[model samples]
Target: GSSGSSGKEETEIIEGEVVEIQIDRPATGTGSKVGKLTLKTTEMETIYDLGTKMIESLTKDKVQAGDVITIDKATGKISKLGRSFTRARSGPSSG
Candidate 1:
């Protein structure tokens, strides 16, 4: 006779593809630039911040909106693929 647990624990690894990327210019207070990258997996949509260091390192000169990127679903690491554009303006316009 043998006794063993019936339940098992499993971990699934997923890969997310970049759907959109938005770069915001000086809008509210200080004139600071910000980048946003949107990723989508089978499970859900995940948004990650393109930090100054990452942008500076990967952008290579320009980081625009709608740029396709990739992310590690488990680790949440992002990488820039190439330059892209968005239908709407990159940032809020001043009135």
Candidate 2:
């Protein structure tokens, strides 16, 4: 004789904002290029490896130091929600 059982599972998703972006240089004499982006969450901090492919895609892009972004805690999906930039000066001003 045998017995049967049933079980259930649950999952949760956490959300946070991206506080900073870090770009690293290649090692000395390695002839290779690599970088990373560090994300600071309310719970913890996670580092994402930025390979050549990813870097190429973001070339010449204006991703400032402090840009607010949304990230999915479980899946690690990062999206640019908004940005915080300094005001641009117009015309010539004397100070």
Candidate 3:
């Protein structure tokens, strides 16, 4: 059964303590419409590609310890990434 197989898996919604994050930008470039990056966690090292914005979000949450995030399989874009963050209320605020 394990004769030959590609070393790859569809990782989605991986939850674990953030081991490390890409500190410096790659020598290639800052980023573009099709940015590629490798984010790591206790579970596994996940690769993501953000078409719009990623560099910003990556650094933002990179410092956190424990975090949960959702990525779009199509382009590996992060939809929701948070660490010990509270969810918004159902109804609108009176203020």
Candidate 4:
């Protein structure tokens, strides 16, 4: 049973273009710090939540819509398509 474990294989690197950027604003008095980063790949569009650090990195890197980017699932790293070596020190989330 252990050998026959049913699970999906991990997708190591996700490559796509930044399609949309939406800031999560307030419905209540307190506001959320998280934002949504949309990526459109050949397969489908995937949305990733940008925490404080991720948003900071995006701003630092000047990553705008239409820019090709990649996300490493293993380390939750974010980088550009050409500059794969440049990885974000912080990730969006742990899990």
Candidate 4, residues 14-70, lDDT tens digits: the string is 877788878766675456467888987655798987766667667778788978877
Residue 72 in model 4: lDDT: 70
Residues 1-95 of candidate 3: C-alpha lDDT, one tens digit per residue: 87978866765554333444444345566544444555455435766544546556655565343455555555544544555443445797777
Q: Supply the TM-score for candidate 3.
A: 0.36
Q: How accurate locally, in lDDT, is each candidate? A: 0.56, 0.52, 0.51, 0.73
TM-score of 1: 0.44
Q: Write down the RMSD of candidate 3 (Cα, Å).
A: 11.6
Off by over 4 Å in 2: 1-16, 26-29, 69-79, 83-95
**Per-residue lDDT of model 2, residues 2-45, tens digit only:** 67557546434322344455656765645455666665554576
Q: For model 3, what is the C-alpha lDDT against the true structure?
A: 0.51
Highest lDDT model number: 4
Count: clashes, candidate 1: 0
Worst 10 residues of 3 by lDDT: 15-24
Question: Would you list the clashing residue pairs of candidate 4?
Answer: none
